[PDB]
Amino acid sequence: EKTVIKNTGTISISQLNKNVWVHTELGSAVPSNGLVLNTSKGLVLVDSSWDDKLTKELIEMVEKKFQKRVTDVIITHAHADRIGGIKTLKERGIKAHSTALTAELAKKNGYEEPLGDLQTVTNLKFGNMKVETFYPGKGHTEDNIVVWLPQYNILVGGCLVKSTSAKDLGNVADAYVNEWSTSIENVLKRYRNINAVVPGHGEVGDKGLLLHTLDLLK
Numbered sequence: 391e392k393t394v395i396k397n398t399g400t401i402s403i404s405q406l407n408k409n410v411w412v413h414t415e416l417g418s419a420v421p422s423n424g425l426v427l428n429t430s431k432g433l434v435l436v437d438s439s440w441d442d443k444l445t446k447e448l449i450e451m452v453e454k455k456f457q458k459r460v461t462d463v464i465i466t467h468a469h470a471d472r473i474g475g476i477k478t479l480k481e482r483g484i485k486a487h488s489t490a491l492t493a494e495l496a497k498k499n500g501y502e503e504p505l506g507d508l509q510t511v512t513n514l515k516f517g518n519m520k521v522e523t524f525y526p527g528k529g530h531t532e533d534n535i536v537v538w539l540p541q542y543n544i545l546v547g548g549c550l551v552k553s554t555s556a557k558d559l560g561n562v563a564d565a566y567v568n569e570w571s572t573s574i575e576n577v578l579k580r581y582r583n584i585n586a587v588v589p590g591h592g593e594v595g596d597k598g599l600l601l602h603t604l605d606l607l608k
């Protein structure tokens with residue numbers, strides 16, 4: 391059984407392996423997932439949380455547990471569950487990575503701006519931790535990216551990828567339902583061997599979540 395650690399219970403982290411954890415927060419009631427990467431040069435998060443209060447608590451929880459600082463965050467699209475803590479990141483000197491499009495949309499919607507440094511494919515390295523970011527096309531939003539850990543074949547699907555418990559596509563106001571399938575296929579083509587898939591919301595699964603999402607798009 392995987393190690394799970396809670397704060398009230400509104401914040402929980404679950405261990406996938408030695409240096410990779412999933413962080414899950416309760417907002418709005420809607421759970422949301424990101425990733426915590428424990429590296430030799432600091433903690434790196436995939437995505438922040440619903441607001442600054444949760445993001446502050448999240449950072450402080452992991453900094454205390456792993457006894458190092460959060461240095462970087464990768465923001466995977468410009469909705470609040472992803473970017474709501476951007477103010478906290480900026481003021482603490484935490485680098486908030488994103489595509490230029492994610493940054494533009496963030497600004498348009500009144501959030502503070504992440505860096506806009508991520509290209510269609512960007513390869514980062516934090517200590518020994520390798521991280522690839524990939525823009526597969528439009529889906530849940532026009533800007534959604536996925537994150538790949540090549541040393542573990544772990545894919546962070548974000549809100550592009552629906553969990554098994556999701557029986558519909560959810561809010562599609564900002565979505566592109568005619569391109570979303572092609573974008574999933576682009577992910578499946580790039581990462582042909584996947585061990586775990588972390589959805590934006592819900593339980594961790596595998597490649598099956600990508601197939602589940604394709605079915606929901608029919």
Ligand SMILES: O=C(O)/C(S)=C/c1c(Cl)ccc(Cl)c1Cl
Binds near residue numbers: 530549564
């Ligand atoms: O279904 C999802 O994954 C997301 S992020 C839903 C959503 C939207 Cl579409 C707008 C705004 C907000 Cl706050 C949320 Cl949570």
Ligand SMILES: [Zn+2]
Binds near residue numbers: 467469530531549
């Ligand atoms: Zn979203």
Ligand SMILES: [Zn+2]
Binds near residue numbers: 469549590591
């Ligand atoms: Zn979401």
